[PDB]
């Protein structure tokens, strides 16, 4: 077991005791988990990455810079 989960760099709720159901995004640069909903990630757009063969990479706000 990894015993990890990371937390959204914006707010990530607080501690996140329900990260299992906590729609978080796994970054491709630092592998950091960003809030799917809080990061303003649309479900459809979020679905497109999840439907892809992993060719893409989800980059978090810090990695994506410009903020």
9 binds Zn ion (CB under 5 A): no
Ramachandran area for residue 12 (φ above 0: left; ψ -120 to 50: alpha; else beta): left
For residue 4, the minimal CB distance to Zn ion (Å) is 15
25 binds Zn ion (CB under 5 A): no
56 binds Zn ion (CB under 5 A): no
The rounded radius of gyration (Å) of the Cα atoms in the chain is 12
41 binds Zn ion (CB under 5 A): no
Q: Which is nearer to Zn ion, 48 or 57 (CB)?
A: 57
């Amino acid at each position: 077991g990894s015993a990890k989960g990371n937390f959204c760099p914006l707010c990530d709720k607080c501690y996140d005791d329900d990260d299992y159901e906590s729609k978080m995004m796994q970054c491709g640069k630092c592998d950091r988990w960003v809030h799917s909903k809080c990061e303003n990630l649309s479900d459809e757009m979020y679905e497109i990455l999840s439907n892809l063969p992993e060719s893409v990479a989800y980059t978090c706000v810090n990695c994506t810079e410009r903020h």
